[PDB]
Write an enzyme that holds these catalytic residues in place. Structure first.
Site, PDB file in Angstrom:
ATOM      1  CD  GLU A  68      26.908   2.501 -22.433  1.00  0.00           C
ATOM      2  OE1 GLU A  68      27.000   1.740 -21.452  1.00  0.00           O
ATOM      3  OE2 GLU A  68      26.341   2.150 -23.491  1.00  0.00           O
TER       4      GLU A  68
ATOM      5  CG  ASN B 295      27.040  -7.483 -19.613  1.00  0.00           C
ATOM      6  OD1 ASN B 295      26.211  -6.633 -19.314  1.00  0.00           O
ATOM      7  ND2 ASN B 295      28.206  -7.184 -20.156  1.00  0.00           N
TER       8      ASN B 295
ATOM      9  CG  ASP C 254      27.591 -12.331 -21.981  1.00  0.00           C
ATOM     10  OD1 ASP C 254      27.902 -11.569 -21.052  1.00  0.00           O
ATOM     11  OD2 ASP C 254      27.943 -12.101 -23.145  1.00  0.00           O
TER      12      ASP C 254
ATOM     13  CB  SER D  94      31.069 -10.513 -20.994  1.00  0.00           C
ATOM     14  OG  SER D  94      29.844  -9.827 -21.204  1.00  0.00           O
TER      15      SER D  94
ATOM     16  CG  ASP E 270      29.549  -3.968 -20.313  1.00  0.00           C
ATOM     17  OD1 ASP E 270      30.073  -4.748 -21.115  1.00  0.00           O
ATOM     18  OD2 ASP E 270      28.326  -3.783 -20.280  1.00  0.00           O
TER      19      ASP E 270
ATOM     20  CG  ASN F 162      31.214  -7.269 -23.419  1.00  0.00           C
ATOM     21  OD1 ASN F 162      31.543  -8.315 -23.949  1.00  0.00           O
ATOM     22  ND2 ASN F 162      30.393  -7.229 -22.395  1.00  0.00           N
TER      23      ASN F 162
END
Length: 129
Positions: free
Chosen positions: A35, A46, A48, A50, A52, A59
């Site tokens: 990750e 991301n 959308d 958002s 991370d 998120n």
């Protein structure tokens, strides 16, 4: 901070992650590896809108507030920047809530695609724990 493999395994263990919700230590180290490459400062945006954050790539749409994600739920009640600290406590406390959410570690796409069903014990091999 960029963690070493065994150093992170030890920090995770001290923080009560070994077998938390039935997931052995190797699972958590494997997920952190894919990750964030063990880098607490990792961020990724991301499509959308958002973002991370941290070692576990948590998120901003549901778990933390970054001040730029409309409709964030901030379920871990913390600013996303807290997840980038060299002290992993916040990241760990939030991951515990995420894994308890009902989908277990499937919540982490890299875990699902790169750790799940593999020999995760290899991730803590050789470490003094």
């Amino acid at each position: 901070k960029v963690f070493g493999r065994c150093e992170l395994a030890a920090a995770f263990k001290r923080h009560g992650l070994d077998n938390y919700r039935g997931y052995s230590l190797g699972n958590w180290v494997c997920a952190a590896k894919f990750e964030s490459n063990f880098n607490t400062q990792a961020t990724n945006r991301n499509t959308d809108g958002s973002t991370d954050y941290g070692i576990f790539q948590i998120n901003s749409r549901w778990w933390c507030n970054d001040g730029r994600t409309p409709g964030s739920r901030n379920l871990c009640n913390i600013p996303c920047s807290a997840l980038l600290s060299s002290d992993i406590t916040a990241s760990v406390n939030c991951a515990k809530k995420i894994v308890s959410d009902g989908n277990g570690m499937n919540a982490w796409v890299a875990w699902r695609n790169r750790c799940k069903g593999t020999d995760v014990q290899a991730w803590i091999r050789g470490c003094r724990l």
